[PDB]
Write an enzyme that holds these catalytic residues in place. Sequence first.
Site, PDB file in Angstrom:
ATOM      1  N   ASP A 153       0.619  10.525 -27.985  1.00  0.00           N
ATOM      2  CA  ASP A 153      -0.513  10.910 -28.771  1.00  0.00           C
ATOM      3  C   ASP A 153      -0.398  12.266 -29.433  1.00  0.00           C
ATOM      4  O   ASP A 153      -0.854  12.440 -30.563  1.00  0.00           O
ATOM      5  CB  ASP A 153      -1.788  10.848 -27.876  1.00  0.00           C
ATOM      6  CG  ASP A 153      -2.097   9.427 -27.414  1.00  0.00           C
ATOM      7  OD1 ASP A 153      -1.663   8.468 -28.109  1.00  0.00           O
ATOM      8  OD2 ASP A 153      -2.733   9.240 -26.335  1.00  0.00           O
TER       9      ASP A 153
ATOM     10  N   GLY B 260      -7.733   9.230 -23.090  1.00  0.00           N
ATOM     11  CA  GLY B 260      -8.038   8.242 -24.151  1.00  0.00           C
ATOM     12  C   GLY B 260      -7.233   8.561 -25.437  1.00  0.00           C
ATOM     13  O   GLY B 260      -7.142   9.704 -25.900  1.00  0.00           O
TER      14      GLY B 260
ATOM     15  N   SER C 261       0.820  -1.225   0.000  1.00  0.00           N
ATOM     16  CA  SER C 261       0.000   0.000   0.000  1.00  0.00           C
ATOM     17  C   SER C 261       0.846   1.264   0.000  1.00  0.00           C
ATOM     18  O   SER C 261       1.700   1.419   0.868  1.00  0.00           O
ATOM     19  CB  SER C 261      -0.918   0.030   1.227  1.00  0.00           C
ATOM     20  OG  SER C 261      -1.845   1.105   1.137  1.00  0.00           O
TER      21      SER C 261
END
Lengths: 298, 303
Positions: free
Chosen positions: B245, B40, B28
């Site tokens: 991108d 996206g 953790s």
Amino acid sequence: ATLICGSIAYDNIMTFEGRINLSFLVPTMRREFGGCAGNIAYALNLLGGDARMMGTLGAVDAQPYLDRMDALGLSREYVRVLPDTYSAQAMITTDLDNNQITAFHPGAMMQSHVNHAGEAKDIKLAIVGPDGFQGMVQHTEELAQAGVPFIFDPGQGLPLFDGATLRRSIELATYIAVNDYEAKLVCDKTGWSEDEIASRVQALIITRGEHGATIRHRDGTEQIPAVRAERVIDPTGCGDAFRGGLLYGIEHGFDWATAGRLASLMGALKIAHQGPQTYAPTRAEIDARFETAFGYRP
Amino acid sequence: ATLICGSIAYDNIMTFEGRFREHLINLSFLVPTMRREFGGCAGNIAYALNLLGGDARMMGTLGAVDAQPYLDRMDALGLSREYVRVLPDTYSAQAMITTDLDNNQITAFHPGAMMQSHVNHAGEAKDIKLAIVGPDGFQGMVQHTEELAQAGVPFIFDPGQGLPLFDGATLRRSIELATYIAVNDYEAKLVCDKTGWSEDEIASRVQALIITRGEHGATIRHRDGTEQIPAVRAERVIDPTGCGDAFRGGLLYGIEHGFDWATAGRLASLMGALKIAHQGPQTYAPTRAEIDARFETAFGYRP
Ligand SMILES: O=c1[nH]cnc2c1ncn2[C@@H]1O[C@H](CO)[C@@H](O)[C@H]1O
Ligand SMILES: O=c1[nH]cnc2c1ncn2[C@@H]1O[C@H](CO)[C@@H](O)[C@H]1O
Ligand code: NA
Ligand code: NA
Ligand code: NA
Ligand code: NA
Ligand code: NA
């Protein structure tokens, strides 16, 4: 009553169907009620104990948790909801073989020191579990000055401590509960041995996973058996269910052998269900199961 | 127009103060800041192409539970939603993206409506002169490659984060159908290994194999030779999320406008450098006049 100090959080249990710019697809996510304080209070409440959660939620999304407390009959008196803040969330990515990696986004947990443990009424016993760092320290101080005995359960907050603050918290604590990895970490950070940590509390409780637990107290060490799980679905919250059982034991005057066995049994029930609080045994069921496993009745 | 097939997602971007390399496991770690961003692959690439003045038509799926913020952003941008399908009773994809001190990233990606991306048929898209097939639901990726090839639309195959879903045979076939392939340098090795082709073999089966190299620029391996593309120095380094991108947007614009590979690669490299100076994939907001002037400043000539 028992004062349950620690995180109150939503857990998002994401499943990786398996086991640099790397992505892992997680097709399923399941949201669950969690947080160390919520989980331990849920367990104590199952047993019929009177659990008083002390922790911070965020106003943006507190309400489902508050409604769930109300439905369960868990008092909200020490649960503070902070305006314009998000509740803690745990992003728990889990694989094939129940291993987990959590990103914990503390949100309102970072303000947990707004609650003062020393102001809590008719508290006979407490636990100080993983929480905002300032809040963990403050609760250990305020409970000690108030003379309320408490379990110190640093858990995932252990990395926020330094040597001095961790040694102090152990001095103040009446009991300590940890798993084996955490015991080692406490040893390493304090520079104390296990004997020396145990010498400073009434008991040092070390859980041993599927193998039960060990309770070291001043004149002896109890080996607690495991209870065979009916199925193994999700370990998230096992430690906390164990701790609910242990606190019920302590508050009700059980000997360590019995308190530890009750805690082991709650762990075993928990692991058979998804999420930390979806197991729902009745108290009569807990007693019958305790008898089946251990041969006597709490 | 250019058809941009790929994921449409909300990104939740977190930093980790360590290196992943030095970190029944029950692990953790505290993530104190998270920033939500529009993301996206298809949204990011279309945003880049639209910055340049290209006509980007996104093809991807969102979920009706939470699509509306992204549809409103598309409308505010003037980005067509003709091929953005919103699936009832479904959540949109969400990336949980963590960046370490070396600017490496680990992402848990929850695909949601992306898993239904094959509901869109790329061969039905009108007025399309060029396309890219980026990371998406696996069925959607394969179907878009098939339908673009059948339609005779030249396309970049950009497997990216989708690479693990491909076997050797499917990846070989996808490269055969594709007109170009774009990957980062780590992915280029994975592709060579999965296909059993060298980089030269892969470049022989397309017009160009484009390999990005992070802060070290890019390589474009092509028919008669190879172009080495310089990196452009960033003005500040804030977040690598979406750098590839942005680069792809610049590359698609150059292809569409018949730029030589040296120029198309430099434009792509510039877009990537601008992106890294900003949080998230789409907050960088250069104008076209700005991009032209920066290109001249960096490269010595106008595109
Ligand atoms: O860093 C942390 N601080 C506090 N609570 C945590 C952290 N990481 C996880 N949990 C909480 O631990 C419970 C299991 O005992 C989970 O329900 C999760 O919400
Ligand atoms: O596994 C994936 N499939 C599709 N899209 C992804 C995946 N992982 C991340 N992203 C998307 O990749 C963009 C950066 O290029 C991010 O905006 C993120 O949403
Ligand atoms: Na723990
Ligand atoms: Na003590
Ligand atoms: Na990529
Ligand atoms: Na080809
Ligand atoms: Na070969």
